[PDB]
Enzyme design. Structure first.
Site, PDB file in Angstrom:
ATOM      1  N   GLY A 222       0.843  -1.173   0.000  1.00  0.00           N
ATOM      2  CA  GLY A 222       0.000   0.000   0.000  1.00  0.00           C
ATOM      3  C   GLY A 222       0.885   1.232   0.000  1.00  0.00           C
TER       4      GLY A 222
ATOM      5  NE  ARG B 178       7.392  -0.260   4.841  1.00  0.00           N
ATOM      6  CZ  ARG B 178       8.358  -0.377   5.745  1.00  0.00           C
ATOM      7  NH1 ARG B 178       9.622  -0.524   5.361  1.00  0.00           N
ATOM      8  NH2 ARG B 178       8.059  -0.355   7.035  1.00  0.00           N
TER       9      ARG B 178
ATOM     10  NE  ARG C 234      -3.865  11.176  -9.251  1.00  0.00           N
ATOM     11  CZ  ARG C 234      -4.732  11.939  -8.596  1.00  0.00           C
ATOM     12  NH1 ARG C 234      -4.665  12.053  -7.271  1.00  0.00           N
ATOM     13  NH2 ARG C 234      -5.670  12.590  -9.270  1.00  0.00           N
TER      14      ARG C 234
ATOM     15  NE  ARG D  65      -3.478  -5.572   0.626  1.00  0.00           N
ATOM     16  CZ  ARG D  65      -2.783  -4.656   1.298  1.00  0.00           C
ATOM     17  NH1 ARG D  65      -1.899  -3.887   0.666  1.00  0.00           N
ATOM     18  NH2 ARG D  65      -2.980  -4.504   2.603  1.00  0.00           N
TER      19      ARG D  65
ATOM     20  CB  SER E 260       0.619  -3.899   7.164  1.00  0.00           C
ATOM     21  OG  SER E 260      -0.002  -2.687   6.757  1.00  0.00           O
TER      22      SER E 260
ATOM     23  CG  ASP F 184      -2.528  -3.003  13.655  1.00  0.00           C
ATOM     24  OD1 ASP F 184      -2.209  -2.953  12.450  1.00  0.00           O
ATOM     25  OD2 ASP F 184      -3.702  -2.861  14.060  1.00  0.00           O
TER      26      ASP F 184
ATOM     27  NE  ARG G  62       8.381  -1.194  10.554  1.00  0.00           N
ATOM     28  CZ  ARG G  62       8.109   0.061  10.213  1.00  0.00           C
ATOM     29  NH1 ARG G  62       8.756   1.066  10.789  1.00  0.00           N
ATOM     30  NH2 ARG G  62       7.181   0.311   9.303  1.00  0.00           N
TER      31      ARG G  62
END
EC number: 2.4.2.1
Lengths: 237, 237, 237, 237, 237, 237
Positions: free
Chosen positions: D20, D24, D43, D87, D90, D204, D217
């Site tokens: 997303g 990353r 963008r 995809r 997280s 989370d 992480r």
């Protein structure tokens, strides 16, 4: 009482006839009831109580649409101990074999409103009339030599609907007439444990716009009120 | 013949009684019909045709659920000329005053299913029975001195619902019995122009918790069957 | 013994093959199972427990539609310790490149039923099979030389859907087969904590109109069965 | 060049990894890809094409929410010949036995969005990944010694949902992780004819409240990446 | 700091202008703000704070879609004391009389999304702007001699909708511009007690088919920005 | 003309004030209009046309509920060339800071009716008022020294709703007042390209049932009609 009915317990009979147009309540009171008395004037929604062949009866208009009749039927049920509510009015037909001036009894009422879904956890509630009240109306009609069709009514929320294709669907599932209260009134009756019935005379036809003299419409309206009044006396027996 | 029925036009009467259980079909045939021949056994859904006091009658199970009974009633109407279908099953009560062994007649039927919505443009279709059949049924139970309540049934998709809050709702709005097909059957009848009625005996009370079982239970069940059989004889006269 | 199954904990193996047709359950038990024993005949919904290459297996019909197989899958999972349910049924093809006798594995199952929306606060629940079971089935297939497409199935509430346009939508989204249980089974397994997989044999084409014919139906019917049975063994390893 | 991607057919490989977070995408291209080349910055939604163990791979962020990744996945599939979308994002855990850093494979994806209902005539579309891609991913994981749960994900439109009770429903139905794209990607792939898979790292816990911490992480973030990349190679074989 | 914003209470003004594009955020800051400092770069969503004619103003992209802008506006309101959010983006027209370069103000916003329904018990929430902000905006455009139309925007979930029949609908009911966030932003504002407004310049006409591009397009876009900046100055007086 | 309006083109002004109670139309005509003339009496729904400070204006009751006002507003728009419709009536408040007799302007109107979903392909239509008409009303109020709150109204279909929890939701999303027409009238205006506004004085409060003298209610009603009449003159400038 109540916000829309300025009266006390006892002022209304346990049986109330409800025409669409309020003006019609006065006409019913002076034409079919004896010893009638005015019991409500709030918002010009005139209510009368009187007798028909000894039977105590009340008449008052319920207004145009589900939200409207929902208010009055509810207040009558819960605040004036009304047991039965008979709506008398007209409807548009969609079936080719349903002629103008035909009497139609709403055993059930389909609808595009959300009132019953809000009430029934968004499931399908079969808004239905009280059976005994349906058969009384049918027997009363028969006694008056009137032919009465019994089946589903469609309670439209929009007299001018954007979906013209819905009329074909109604025709396909046998809807006898299109009006705008039945589904609502049947909903309130079930919610507050009372009994309801809707009787309609076919006014127009979504098909070929025929024509009826004011005299004919007058005759048919009196026929319907007679059915209603006589059906009540049958229900008492 | 059709996908789920191995028979030919003629094998059935124009009136079919339908219990949910095929084994119950056989029971009906051997108990009330004379000279009953087996007309279908596909998927084990036993169908039988015989005569009741000279009138040709058929009895066939429709399985459990709207999806199931929808297939059979439909094929019966559209391929075997059946004009009437009377479902004769059991139901659970939610209303305190509704006791076990009570004969209930579904003038209308609410539902969980999405079938009629698919049919009625996501609107509310009031799944109702055929008025004459309801009346024929009432009159028959009367002739047999049986008390029959007429009203709304609830057709659940899930016999084991994940939400029990729905039962308080059914009760509030007066639903007389909880079953799983009526709404489906009335939807089919309207869609294909047939006539249907659902008669149920209360075999369980989701309230006081109690599933009927005794010579008494079996006696009431047979009454329901006689009310169904006798109602067609009346419809004929 | 539950409401629809007269058996006792132990009469069923931990995995059950379930066709919609009770007579298929019987055929499977006779043709593929050793020491087949009938463990249920309530409502004629035949159930059997036997041995396959030494493994305790059970086979029982579930009837037609989500409401029906929801009842049986539920009862099995909660009262008979069934850990895995493999539905071995028939479906309709909608894609051109899918012909009769094809074997499809429902990794997922679309539907027009409301059961899952009811279970999922009206949101979208992706009715999906157990990954390992799908993988086992795919592996069992290659070992048998049988072809099997893996993907979405569509569980319909109306075998006779009044909405023909929906088939175009199913096609556009690659539905491999149209049946009437998958989404329900997957719904039940998730709710009651078990695992399920649906394998279907294309018994007919919704576009061309071709039902089960010749002796082909059998072996292809047996192909599905062989795959389901072997996949159970692969899962054990 | 499309409305949101300034590239030309050829700038992208046939498979694209999509996190997303645009940053990353960049990190992935720098850490795992050779000869990484930026192919889009419109963008600020950074896109890259490089090589992984000799294979042409592409990586580009898709932004947050179904509407966002629907645009990018669509444009890639229709104007840049992308056959596979993976995809790598997280999610939030809701099950007790699921802890931070866990890697989940979304065989399916539930959602509260309306996109698919819009695509599926308001019925239930089972948003599912491509079986082989899920299998490849599971195999790539075992070869890496990494644990990976396979099952349903829940794509939420509101990261800050006003309905906390829904999380209980997700838990009861075994949702492995709550994210915001899966159902959309799977929706787009099906509509535009491509294949997709979502792999997520639990960043989370919705119940305990624990976000990404320590250097953990990273490697776990890299675990997901490693799995996604290898699975692409397994698919090639 | 919050999950998607790496800043501290104070870094933002109590008024945040939000374009969809972070790169557009930077453009706003360097073109109209004096002494603009970058206050957030997480996920590349550039946020800036500076002064416009002495008033402290902030500008930050909110990404594309309701799900995206919902996260940011919410975190701004609940963690950075922001009291007003003005979205400044582009939109496509469907109405013939609405021309390119037209400045549109979304007094209200219709939508595809299901977010407000989740918030409003599946009922109809009228996503509206803050009246004073709408007026401040109108008056500012007036002072700048700019013609601004006020009305309804349509917030689509899918930039590439699978149903183009929706555009005739938007047009029929007078929707002025088609975008993808307003409805989401007004939902958030109402949910967390903030005030929001969405201003758009028509950059495309889904009718005559024409995407604006010229010194003229860029001139109108800057007008919109000045109307936004100037509207806060008015709100202050 | 029309079924409910017995008049011809020209009889009504292009601006119609619509009170709930018909009785109020006569009061408005003789109290604020000069040279008034009766233009409709059908169903006792009295309509009048006259002038206010030289401005031609019409007044007529729209009845109770969305279905009702939907009929009249539509016929006026399409058959009598009515451009603007101002509904004047009362509402119940849910916010603690909204006192009785407060004037409220419905910039927007939430609702539980299905009319707009039927119109807007089951999506969310933002039923909104005409901006200029809103600001005129606000400026007019200001000139009369009256404080006017502007925001969302909630158009209930059930005055007696089964969901008592909905009032809390309304309070949470800032609903200023609860009435029963706004959403409907705004729907018709958008459908037929006209302009609408709803002004309400707070009658009761779902909170502590305060009390207002008949004299006070009279004063407040005249204040509202003055706002409406003066807002029209402002709109003309």
């Amino acid at each position: 009482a109540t916000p829309h009915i300025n009266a006390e317990m006892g002022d209304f009979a346990d049986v109330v006839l409800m025409p669409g147009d309020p003006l019609r309540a006065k006409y019913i009171a002076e034409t079919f009831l004896e010893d009638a008395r005015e019991v409500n004037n709030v918002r010009g929604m005139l209510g009368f109580t009187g007798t028909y062949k000894g039977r105590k009866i009340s008449v008052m208009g319920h207004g145009v649409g589900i939200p409207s009749c929902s208010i009055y039927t509810k207040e009558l049920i819960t605040d004036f101990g009304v047991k039965k509510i008979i709506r008398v009015g007209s409807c548009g037909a969609v079936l080719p074999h349903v002629k103008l001036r035909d009497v139609v009894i709403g055993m059930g009422a389909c609808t595009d409103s959300k009132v019953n879904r809000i009430r029934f956890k968004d499931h399908d509630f079969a808004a239905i009339a009280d059976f005994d009240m349906v058969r009384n109306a049918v027997d009363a009609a028969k006694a008056l030599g009137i032919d009465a069709r019994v089946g589903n009514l469609f309670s439209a929320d929009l007299f001018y609907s954007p979906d013209g294709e819905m009329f074909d669907v109604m025709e396909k599932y046998g809807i006898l007439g299109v009006e705008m209260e039945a589904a609502g009134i049947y909903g309130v009756a079930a919610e507050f444990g009372a009994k309801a019935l809707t009787i309609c005379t076919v006014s127009d036809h979504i098909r070929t716009h025929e024509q009826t003299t004011a005299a004919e419409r007058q005759t048919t309206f009196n026929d319907m009120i007679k059915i209603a009044l006589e059906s009540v006396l049958l229900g008492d027996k």
